[PDB]
């Protein structure tokens, strides 16, 4: 069906908001590769930007055939 | 796609593709300088040495032929030289 009172029962849930902005965290998990990607473009190493420790010795693409 | 700047390519595609289909004809091989740690002199050898090679004076064997490049003796220093 279609709604004209825009479904108040979750419209008021949309009016409900967390106090935190859900993206302005105290720290953000950033890989070094995207860090040096953003480093050459406009902004260097910021306080909110941290270096991910390398846990990449094991690879991807689990076997299918 | 259709539109590529064939006149002035980025260097990664002519170090990417095969040598015969580059924009200009350029080989992927080079000349190499190798010396023995027990000896003193520096000889000049190809990247694909193609045979057994011995330095003058008969000190040691430098490298062995292999179907790809040459497999060098361990401990020997090397410098990528260009003209």
């Amino acid at each position: 069906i279609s709604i004209k009172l825009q479904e108040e029962e979750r419209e008021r849930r949309d009016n409900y908001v967390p106090e935190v902005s859900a993206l302005d965290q105290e720290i953000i998990e950033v890989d070094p590769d995207t860090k040096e990607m953003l480093k050459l473009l406009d902004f260097g190493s910021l306080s909110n930007l941290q270096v991910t420790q390398p846990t990449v010795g094991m690879n991807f693409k689990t076997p299918r055939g | 796609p259709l539109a590529k700047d064939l006149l002035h390519p980025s260097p990664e595609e002519e170090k990417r593709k095969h040598k015969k289909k580059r924009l200009v004809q350029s080989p992927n091989s080079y000349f190499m300088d190798v010396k023995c740690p027990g000896c003193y002199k520096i000889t000049t050898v190809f990247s694909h040495a193609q045979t057994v090679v011995l330095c003058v004076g008969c000190s040691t064997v430098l490298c062995q032929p292999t179907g790809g490049k040459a497999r060098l003796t361990e401990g020997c220093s090397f410098r990528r030289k260009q003209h």
């Binding site: 690879n59 693409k61 689990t62 076997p63 299918r64 | -």
Partner: protein, 88 residues
């Protein structure tokens, strides 16, 4: 080959394996390796040692095939030749 009374004395004559185990060993997407040597012991016993070999897929392997080259099989077979020559 030796009885005197109410007893039978035995001797080793040959070793085999069950058909179910060797049928469980043979599977697709792997290489089967066979190697036999006619060997002699210090006494006058002439033996014949049949062995089988089956390749192992790696735990991080993505390939389903998991085969080997022919000269690798020949080298493994020659290793089996010298092992069963040495130990008997």
């Amino acid at each position: 080959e030796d009885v005197q009374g109410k007893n039978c004395l035995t001797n080793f004559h040959g070793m085999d394996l069950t058909r179910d185990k060797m049928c469980s060993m043979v599977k697709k997407w792997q290489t089967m390796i066979e190697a036999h040597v006619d060997v002699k012991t210090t006494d006058g016993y002439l033996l014949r040692l049949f062995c089988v070999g089956f390749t192992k897929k790696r735990n991080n392997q993505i390939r389903k095939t998991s085969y080997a080259q022919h000269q690798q099989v020949r080298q493994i077979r020659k290793k089996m030749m010298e092992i069963m020559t040495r130990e008997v």
